From a paper:
Siphophage T1 is representative of the T series of model Escherichia coli phages, which has been observed to infect not only sensitive strains of E. coli but also some strains of Shigella dysenteriae. Siphophages possess a long, flexible, and non-contractile tail that plays a crucial role in host recognition, cell envelope penetration, and DNA injection. Connected to the head through a connector complex, the tail of a siphophage consists of three main components: a tail tube, a tape measure protein (TMP), and a distal tip. Using cryo-EM, we resolved the three-dimensional (3D) structures of the icosahedral head, head–tail complex and the tail tip of a laboratory-adapted fiberless mature T1 at resolutions of 3.5 Å, 3.6 Å, and 4.3 Å, respectively.
Author numbering:
A (entry chain F): 27 to 54
B (entry chain F): 108 to 319
C (entry chain E): 161 to 266
D (entry chain E): 55 to 107
The structure:
Amino acid sequence: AAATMGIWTAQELHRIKSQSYEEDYPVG
Amino acid sequence: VFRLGNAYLISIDEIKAGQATGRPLSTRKASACQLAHDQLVNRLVFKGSAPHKIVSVFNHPNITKITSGKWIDVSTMKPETAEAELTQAIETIETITRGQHRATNILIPPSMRKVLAIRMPETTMSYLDYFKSQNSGIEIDSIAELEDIDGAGTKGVLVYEKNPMNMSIEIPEAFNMLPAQPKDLHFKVPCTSKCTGLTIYRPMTIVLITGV
Amino acid sequence: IVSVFNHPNITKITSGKWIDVSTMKPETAEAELTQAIETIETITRGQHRATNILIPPSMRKVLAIRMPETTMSYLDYFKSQNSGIEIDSIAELEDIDGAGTKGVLV
Amino acid sequence: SALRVFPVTTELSPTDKTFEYMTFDKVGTAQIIADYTDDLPLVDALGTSEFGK
């Protein structure tokens, strides 16, 4: 029940894309 | 005239988190609040409410209504009834109003664009081009609110003249946000506005074709 | 890994054969292309409009039949009324499911 | 023709193993009210995200 995991965490190899998407709700 | 309103809540920790992350919540909530009022106004104009006794555009008693043969029967499309019905509706306004008013605008569902695209039996131009050539001055446009006019799926077409002396929508008070009223470690921001609806002043300048 | 044709959340349209046994129907192709163009615009509500079409390299032969009593062809009229869209053919659409089922991408 | 008919992007560095993109939307309503009102509709918001390999 000890710790065996590797040196690098999962967040040091991860990319968040710059764009985000927003839904459109036309008034009419 | 009538009046509308809604509100929204937010806390202090949410404000501080929004400031420190570059993604505020207040702006999004206010945008939703304004969008709600705009959509309610649109619903009042195009559908009306029964308990408040508001009449929609399609339910005005003293307007001209014409039943039509299906422009698309089951699946077959009929280019030639559309032109006949449009010309008849154009003539009706001038005949009834005795020359004072003439049609300037047409509004069709966004499938009748496909209908009016078939090439004329002769030459290459479509029915739309010939209709515009022989009916110069009239502007054709399509909106998506004309496909479920009654609630059971029956499309309709409106031919009318646009002039502030024949029809009008009024908003005596715009969207306002009252100052926040704090509570224990959070707030409450109310919003309100006013609206009237659509009033037809000379109900002989609008022709509705039902069943297209 | 999901392929282009096997993705769950995409719009799929079942079509009547453009060439049934051996007879060619050059009028169903235009109707189906117009319907497929309309669906994208209606669902995305004006933000997104179709710009490209990819057909099998034999429906390219299909869309070359001349108008019954005109100088133009069906492709020319379709392009004239749908300006902005480019049509191209790739050989990868002649077998989609692995048992001989052609397809078109809009 | 996989590369020609579909766009090619160069965001990912060689050492990445995953990537993520996020979306948002909104929810709300409104009603016809009279003066001296304490019942007023409310609005909110919500997001989500997805990954790749």
